[PDB]
Design a protein around this ligand. Structure first.
Ligand SMILES: CC(=O)N[C@H]1/C(=N/OC(=O)Nc2ccccc2)O[C@H](CO)[C@@H](O)[C@@H]1O
Length: 580
C-alpha cells in the first residue's frame, strides 16, 4: 500500500468481490469517490462522509483528521467512510490497491495524512510541462493522495514578468480550465501562483492589477492562490509591503469569496543561507502576515534536505509551521543530468513542524513521477517511510512491463555531479564495493578477485539489456521520449566498460590494440551525443553514470594503457576525456 496507512490490521482470509452487491450511500458520498467505486465494480458496501446517513454506524471509527478515513473489508460488508469528501476519495484510492485478481483481503484501516498539504510545485526554469503531461500528473497525484499542485513555471510570461498583469489568451485559458476541472475530480487543489516581484510598483494600481488577475483565474475555477517573491531584485524585497499586500489579498479576496482554500507565499529570503544575518526580513513576515497565510521554505540552502534543526530555525521566526518547497528532483541547474534516484535526507519525525511539503520536479514530467510517488509516500506517513522500497514501488508503478530495466537505468542516473548549488546524491551503490575492490587492486599491481570482475561485467551486460529494452518500450512512450538521449549514452557507457575489461583480461597485443581503438571510438560517440543532443544554453548535453561507473571505466583505461606502455614501451595515449 502506497502511501502506507497509519493503521492497518490484516486478517488471513481473502474475500471475492461481490457479483451482487448493495450500495449504501451512493447518492450521499463524494461523487468522485463513488465514480471510482463504480469503476472498480447482495453484499453491503457502505460509502460516505462523517455526518452522512450511510456511515452513521461507523462515525466512531472514522479518524478525527481532515482527509481521514476508515476502511473495512469482511464476510458481510465493505465500509468506505471518510471524515470528509476527500477522505472518502482516499479510502477508494487505498481500496483499489487492495483489490487484486477480483479478490480482497480481510482488513481494517484507519488512515489520514501526517502533513496537511502534499504535492508538486511546477516551479522550475526551463520548458513548462505540456498540457497532456499536466493532465497525467493530476490523475497521478489523486492516486497517491497528493492534494496540492502549485502551477508556477518560471518561464510562463503570464505567471512571471512582464505579463503577470495580463489575463491568459483564450486558448491557454481554456486549457487552464480543463486542468482545474481535472484537479477537482482527482481531489487536488489547483494552486495558481503569480510572480510579480521583479517589476511590481507598491501603489494602488499594481496591487489592483494583481487582484484583477486573481479574479480572472477565479472565473476559470481556481480556488487556491500563491504569490512568489523569490529570485527578485529591488523595492519588491521589502517584507512590510509584501505582508500588507498579501493581507490585502487575504482580506479583500480570500475572505470575501465563499470557497478559497489555500493562500501561499514565497519569501524573498527562502533558505537559511539566503537570509540576511543582520536584518529583519523573516520575523517581520512572521509578525505581520495573517495567520492563515502559508510561508514557503527550501531548507538551509536553495537545494537542501529538511532536518529538525533546520525546520525549527525557520519556524521560530515565521511564527508558524513552514510550508516546504523541496528542490528535488529539479534539474534546471544540471540540465544534462537526469535525477531518478530515491527520495531521502528528510527527517521523518518532523511532520508536526510543517504545513505542507512540495517537490519542485524536472522539466521531464514522467521521469519525475519516481520522486513524486516517493514524496507522496513520505508526506502522508513519514514514520513508515521506506526510501528504497518506495523507489522500487514507484518504478513498478510507472513501468511494470520493464521495471527491472528502469531500476537498473535509474540506479546509475541519480547524482548531480559537481554543480553551482553544491548538492549531491548516491549513485551506483550496489556495484561500488566491487568497483573499488577492483581499482585499488589493479592500480598497484595486485591481482583482482574473480567475483569483482564478474559483478562489473554483469553490471555492464545488464546496463545494455536495460537500455535496449527501454528504447523499444511502448507502455510509457512519453517517459521513453524524455530519457532516450540518456538511454543511448548509458548504453555506450556500458559498451565502453566491457571493452575496457577486455583490455584487462587482455589476450595478445593486436587484440589489446583493437579494444584500445574501439574504446577511443565509443568515447568519440559519447562526445558526439553530448554535443548534439539536449543542447540547452545552460548545461548542454547528456551525462550519465557519472559518479562511480564512468570514473571506474576512465581510471581503469588509463591504468591498463599505462601497463601496456611499460610492457612493450609504447606511445599509446592514456586519456579518455580528450576534447574535440
Ligand atoms: C524557491 C526556489 O527554489 N526558487 C527558484 C530557485 N532559485 O535558485 C537560485 O536563485 N539560485 C541561485 C541564484 C543566484 C546565485 C546562486 C544560486 O532555485 C530552484 C532550482 O534551481 C528553481 O527551480 C526555483 O524556481
Amino acid at each position: 500500500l502506497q502511501p502506507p496507512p497509519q493503521q492497518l490490521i490484516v486478517q488471513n482470509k481473502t474475500i471475492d468481490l461481490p457479483a451482487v452487491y448493495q450500495l449504501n450511500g451512493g447518492e450521499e458520498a463524494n461523487p468522485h469517490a463513488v465514480k471510482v467505486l463504480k469503476e472498480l465494480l447482495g453484499m453491503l458496501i457502505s460509502i460516505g462522509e462523517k455526518g452522512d446517513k450511510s456511515v452513521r454506524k461507523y462515525s466512531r471509527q472514522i479518524p478525527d483528521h481532515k482527509e481521514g478515513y476508515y476502511l473495512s473489508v469482511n464476510e458481510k460488508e465493505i465500509v468506505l467512510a471518510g471524515n470528509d469528501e476527500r477522505g472518502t476519495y482516499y479510502a477508494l484510492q487505498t481500496f483499489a490497491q487492495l483489490l487484486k485478481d477480483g479478490k480482497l483481503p480481510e482488513v481494517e484501516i484507519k488512515d489520514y495524512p501526517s502533513v496537511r498539504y502534499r504535492g508538486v510545485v511546477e516551479g522550475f526554469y526551463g520548458t513548462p510541462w505540456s498540457h497532456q503531461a499536466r493532465l497525467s500528473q493530476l490523475k497521478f497525484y489523486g492516486k497517491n493522495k497528493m492534494n496540492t499542485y502549485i502551477y508556477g513555471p518560471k518561464d510562463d510570461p503570464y505567471h512571471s514578468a512582464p505579463n503577470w498583469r495580463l489575463p491568459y489568451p483564450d486558448k491557454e485559458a481554456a486549457q487552464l480550465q480543463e486542468l482545474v476541472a481535472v484537479a477537482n475530480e482527482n481531489e487536488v487543489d489547483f494552486v495558481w501562483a503569480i510572480h510579480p516581484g521583479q517589476d511590481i510598483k507598491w501603489n494602488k494600481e499594481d496591487r489592483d492589477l494583481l487582484l484583477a488577475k486573481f479574479e480572472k483565474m477565479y472565473q476559470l475555477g481556481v480556488r487556491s492562490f500563491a504569490v512568489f517573491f523569490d529570485d527578485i531584485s529591488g523595492e519588491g524585497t521589502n517584507p512590510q509591503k509584501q505582508a500588507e499586500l498579501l493581507n490585502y489579498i487575504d482580506e479583500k479576496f480570500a475572505q470575501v469569496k465563499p470557497d478559497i482554500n489555500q493562500l501561499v507565499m514565497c519569501p524573498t529570503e527562502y533558505n537559511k543561507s539566503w537570509s540576511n544575518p543582520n536584518g529583519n526580513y523573516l520575523t517581520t513576515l512572521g509578525d505581520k502576515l495573517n495567520p492563515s497565510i502559508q510561508i514557503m521554505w527550501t531548507g538551509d540552502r536553495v537545494i537542501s534536505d529538511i532536518t529538525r534543526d533546520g525546520i525549527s530555525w525557520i519556524n521560530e521566526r515565521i511564527k508558524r509551521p513552514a510550508y516546504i518547497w523541496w528542490n528535488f528532483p529539479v534539474s534546471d541547474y544540471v540540465r544534462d543530468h537526469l535525477l531518478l534516484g530515491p527520495v531521502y535526507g528528510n527527517d521523518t519525525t518532523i511532520a508536526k513542524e510543517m504545513s505542507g511539503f512540495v517537490t519542485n520536479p524536472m522539466e521531464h514530467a514522467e521521469s519525475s513521477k519516481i520522486a513524486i510517488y516517493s514524496v507522496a509516500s513520505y508526506a502522508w506517513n513519514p514514520a513508515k517511510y521506506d526510501t528504497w522500497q518506495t523507489w522500487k514501488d514507484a518504478i513498478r508503478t510507472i513501468l511494470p512491463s520493464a521495471a527491472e530495466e528502469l531500476e537498473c537505468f535509474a540506479m546509475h542516473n541519480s547524482d548531480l555531479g559537481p554543480n553551482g548549488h553544491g548538492y549531491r546524491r548516491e549513485e551506483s551503490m550496489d556495484i561500488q564495493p566491487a568497483a573499488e575492490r577492483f581499482l585499488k587492486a589493479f592500480k598497484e599491481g595486485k591481482n583482482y578477485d574473480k567475483a569483482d570482475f564478474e559483478t562489473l561485467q554483469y553490471t555492464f551486460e545488464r546496463m545494455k539489456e536495460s537500455a535496449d529494452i527501454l528504447l523499444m518500450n511502448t507502455e510509457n512512450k512519453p517517459l521513453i521520449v524524455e530519457i532516450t538521449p540518456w538511454v543511448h549514452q548509458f548504453k555506450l557507457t556500458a559498451e565502453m566498460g566491457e571493452e575496457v575489461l577486455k583490455m584487462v583480461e587482455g589476450r595478445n597485443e593486436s587484440y589489446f590494440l583493437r579494444k584500445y581503438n574501439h574504446v577511443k571510438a565509443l568515447q568519440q560517440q559519447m562526445f558526439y551525443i553530448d554535443q548534439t543532443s539536449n543542447q540547452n544554453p545552460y548545461q548542454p548535453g547528456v551525462k550519465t553514470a557519472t559518479r562511480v561507473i564512468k570514473p571506474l571505466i576512465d581510471r581503469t583505461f588509463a591504468t591498463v594503457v599505462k601497463f601496456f606502455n611499460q610492457k612493450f614501451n609504447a606511445h599509446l595515449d592514456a586519456t579518455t576525456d580528450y576534447m574535440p
